[PDB]
Design an enzyme around this catalytic site. Structure first.
Site, short mmCIF file in Angstrom:
data_model
loop_
_atom_site.label_atom_id
_atom_site.label_comp_id
_atom_site.label_asym_id
_atom_site.label_seq_id
_atom_site.Cartn_x
_atom_site.Cartn_y
_atom_site.Cartn_z
N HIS A 157 -58.59 -92.79 -18.28
CA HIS A 157 -59.69 -93.73 -18.55
C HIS A 157 -61.08 -93.09 -18.46
O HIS A 157 -62.08 -93.78 -18.57
CB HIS A 157 -59.61 -94.96 -17.63
CG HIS A 157 -58.39 -95.80 -17.85
ND1 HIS A 157 -57.74 -95.84 -19.06
CD2 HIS A 157 -57.72 -96.63 -17.02
CE1 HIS A 157 -56.70 -96.66 -18.97
NE2 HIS A 157 -56.67 -97.15 -17.74
N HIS A 203 -48.71 -97.50 -27.54
CA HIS A 203 -49.81 -98.35 -28.01
C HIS A 203 -50.92 -97.53 -28.67
O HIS A 203 -51.28 -96.45 -28.21
CB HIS A 203 -50.37 -99.24 -26.88
CG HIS A 203 -51.00 -98.51 -25.73
ND1 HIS A 203 -52.34 -98.19 -25.69
CD2 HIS A 203 -50.49 -98.09 -24.55
CE1 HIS A 203 -52.62 -97.57 -24.56
NE2 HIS A 203 -51.52 -97.51 -23.84
N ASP A 262 -54.45 -91.63 -23.53
CA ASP A 262 -53.87 -92.92 -23.31
C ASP A 262 -54.24 -93.82 -24.49
O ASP A 262 -55.38 -94.25 -24.56
CB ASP A 262 -54.43 -93.48 -22.00
CG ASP A 262 -53.97 -94.89 -21.69
OD1 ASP A 262 -52.98 -95.36 -22.28
OD2 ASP A 262 -54.59 -95.51 -20.82
N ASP A 314 -45.97 -93.68 -22.65
CA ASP A 314 -47.34 -93.96 -22.22
C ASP A 314 -47.80 -92.85 -21.27
O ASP A 314 -47.04 -91.92 -21.00
CB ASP A 314 -47.41 -95.33 -21.52
CG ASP A 314 -48.79 -96.00 -21.66
OD1 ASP A 314 -49.81 -95.29 -21.88
OD2 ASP A 314 -48.84 -97.25 -21.54
N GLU A 356 -52.59 -103.14 -26.04
CA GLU A 356 -51.96 -102.91 -24.73
C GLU A 356 -52.96 -102.97 -23.60
O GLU A 356 -52.64 -103.47 -22.53
CB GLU A 356 -51.27 -101.56 -24.69
CG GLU A 356 -50.44 -101.28 -23.42
CD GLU A 356 -51.21 -100.59 -22.28
OE1 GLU A 356 -52.36 -100.12 -22.51
OE2 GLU A 356 -50.64 -100.51 -21.17
N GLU A 357 -54.15 -102.43 -23.82
CA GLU A 357 -55.13 -102.30 -22.75
C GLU A 357 -55.67 -103.65 -22.27
O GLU A 357 -56.24 -103.73 -21.20
CB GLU A 357 -56.29 -101.40 -23.20
CG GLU A 357 -55.92 -99.95 -23.52
CD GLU A 357 -55.50 -99.10 -22.30
OE1 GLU A 357 -55.48 -99.61 -21.16
OE2 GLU A 357 -55.23 -97.90 -22.48
#
EC number: 3.2.1.4
Lengths: 331, 331, 330
Positions: B307, B60, B168, B220, B197-198
């Site tokens: 994140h 993604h 990510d 991923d 995607e998130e």
């Protein structure tokens, strides 16, 4: 039906690893189906008959379980649940792994106060599996990370009730197999034995795609709230007959299908009960959302102690459910 | 790959506004693909080769971020998370908006006592962004409601580890770009660089629909649990090689695909590790649920501080992942 | 020894209803004992050999369990623990009753929130047993109030370890029976297979009274703290050999008996370990408090998951213990 139910419940099939269940089902069906295919996810689709109306009967073949996430230096395992298995259900229980290895579930706690606190707030972080290994290397040889396990428990008869692991949803599988074994279908009947229901209704989300169904009926277990201090808002009971699911958190059944089933049940005087479930979901949702949408419903087997290693059903309800489906779809 | 990773991670691409990232990927792929298309949601789909087997590689292109929800009289902004960005990561941080504006994240609290309680249970309701505005009208001109932002932080080398925002899944994007650049495929290789995607795996949920794939492998990030007091049940570590995802909360990898990948890895002696993730999900779920179902798996890059604005990877893991895919899909 | 252990652990013998176990022990001992008697409480007392020194070896034959206290209208049973069985161990388990009835343990909870709350603070008041009855009438016929049950679980081998219910203290029984089969005793050897250990050390409280013992040695299980986050103050481990109990909450072992055993182990190169237990007790207490007092000690089999339905031992520890005792007394 007892032997079929004993065989299916005892078979090893946690989510994503259901092949052994699928094979047993195929064998049971030989001579009772016109054709079958197995799709990419591992869904088994079978068919019998040539009637104008096309109907899916769905039961999922996966059961709840555990999977190994890590190994420590002394060879104890950590696990993650596969589906909704409670950590409280696991304490002191035995687990059967895919290769036949047996492990024992233990709980951490360096002091008696810590053990007492842990059990008060139990989580998988506090649990481990002992497979008799004495080192990390030895444990990896037997059960590497990513190994799947199920309850080490089997079928037993308890004063006229059947008790086993995986009534959810082997009891559903048994119902559909039995319908195919017995029925002379007035419809074109599709049997879908779907994978990975317990981890997001995955198999039934695509199994309908290649099947031109007018209707889909999911067969699954539901909460039998007839135990002491049972879930108060749930009406379902053992020996109350098939439970016609009006609604659960995943789906609302087609009113037209429920009315058909109700009319059939009344005409042939089959005992039945209405169900509204305040938690949980079924494969009905998957068929409902496929392509332009397949009108779907769920018929449930009342089951006590769902997600325990001793789920309990009344054999009269199972038979009545096979009868109801036969009367609805043929003779 | 260092320059490619530096370029992809530093690019602006929060969920739903991934265009700049897509353009860069297209430019990097030039001369290494047979063809490409961009679908209605912004998924970039590319292809190379003519093999019998058809395989999707997915990464993604969206990153986590923030979006502006309100403006007050004094010109301060209120924000909502895009994807799973924790408020705690946000504090004292700078945000880079799409139009290039920089903002500073501040926290509310009328007393030191209030500030202490707010940080004790931090929420987005307690945060604000300062973009230097002196009025609502002025702020409305710079960053009106609905403006998207991401971390204002960049790529840096840390004693041989790579650190940037949005490893990510820009690291995933890099892997696939590098595969296409190097590979002579024995397969027909489809590269999907999927959006959003998130925020619910939106892109990979439809990108497969128009691609006749036999297999889908999602690339991923995963949690590298090798920091002090790391997530105890997670086994993944930096320099352990690509992580083959057995299961996460969103999907269970196709057993056949994992076994194929495992064999390739053992045969070419590529470092690898088995992964069970106790939280999170990947685009593998979208392909699994596409049409009649595409057997799917995930291969993950071990990443620390996912994140955060300083996600950390080991370049050796990325190269091994590039190697594993080439061996699996070609030479 | 496997089959002796398998038979004993599987036999039905909760506190106060140990008869089936007693019979099996007697059958196994046939031809290996000079004589035996069973007293008023049901203690099985046996003897072999002659000698100036008289020594008791004790293991209790009772195991933990449950008893039915009440029946409701729908035929469900409420239970009370027999010994220290945790309600958390019972959830979702099967219970086997004396007449062979099988029951399923369920938990109360009218709302999902209530069920979580009940699990948070589980008690026997929140449990019930389902034996498949549809009415009180039907249930009182199958399993009336006062029916005893034990874990419905059996013996299995787990990668060289033994797992079953009631290693506590069937594993102790098997050791003593094995000593009797093998030993040519240098003492008059008394074997006491005692009742109701789990409910206050009742049997061993009187079993010594009619026996002129110089020494008493209790054989029982101990906490094997070699699991993840095990009881940190406990040193005992599997495959560490018999554990010589210095102290637990019930008794302090005679230093003299411990020293004899240590010297025997050193002489014959038997592995052994020292035990200090921060909770629990053994029959050793009963003998030391008998009459003018019998100096007593405990030798322990290291066991994991004590009071679970899957208790685990290492056969090497057991075999080593039989060895230690033979060397000491024969």
């Amino acid at each position: 039906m007892k032997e079929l139910i004993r065989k299916l419940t005892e078979a090893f099939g946690p989510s994503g690893r259901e092949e052994e269940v699928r094979s047993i089902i195929l064998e049971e069906l030989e001579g009772h189906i016109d054709g079958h295919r197995i799709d990419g996810l591992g869904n088994l689709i079978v068919w019998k008959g040539s009637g104008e109306k096309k109907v899916i009967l769905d039961a999922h073949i996966d059961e709840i379980g555990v999977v190994v996430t890590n190994v420590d230096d002394k060879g104890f395992l950590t696990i993650e649940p596969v589906g909704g298995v409670s950590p409280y259900m696991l304490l002191g229980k035995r687990i059967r792994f895919e290769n036949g290895t047996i492990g024992v579930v233990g709980m951490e706690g360096e002091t008696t106060e810590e053990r007492q606190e842990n059990v008060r707030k139990l989580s998988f972080d506090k649990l481990f599996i002992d497979i008799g290994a004495n080192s990390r290397e030895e444990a990896q040889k037997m059960c590497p990370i990513g190994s799947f396990g199920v309850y080490d428990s089997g079928f037993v008869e308890v004063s006229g009730k059947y008790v086993s692991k995986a009534m959810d949803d082997r009891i559903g599988c048994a119902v559909i197999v039995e319908v195919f074994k017995r029925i002379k279908p007035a419809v074109t009947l599709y049997g879908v034995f779907s994978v990975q229901e317990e981890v997001g209704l995955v198999g039934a989300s695509v199994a309908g795609y290649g099947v031109p169904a007018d209707e889909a009926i999911a067969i699954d277990v539901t909460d039998s709230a007839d135990t002491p201090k049972a879930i108060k808002r749930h009406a379902m009971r053992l020996s109350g007959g098939p439970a016609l699911k009006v609604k659960d958190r995943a789906s609302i059944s087609s009113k037209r299908i429920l009315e058909n089933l109700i009319e059939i049940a009344e005409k042939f005087d089959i005992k039945y009960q209405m169900e509204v479930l305040t938690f949980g979901g079924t494969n009905a949702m998957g068929y409902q959302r496929t392509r332009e949408g397949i009108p779907s419903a769920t018929v449930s087997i009342p089951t006590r102690y769902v997600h325990s290693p001793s789920e309990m059903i009344a054999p009269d309800d199972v038979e009545a459910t096979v009868d109801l489906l036969i009367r609805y779809l043929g003779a």
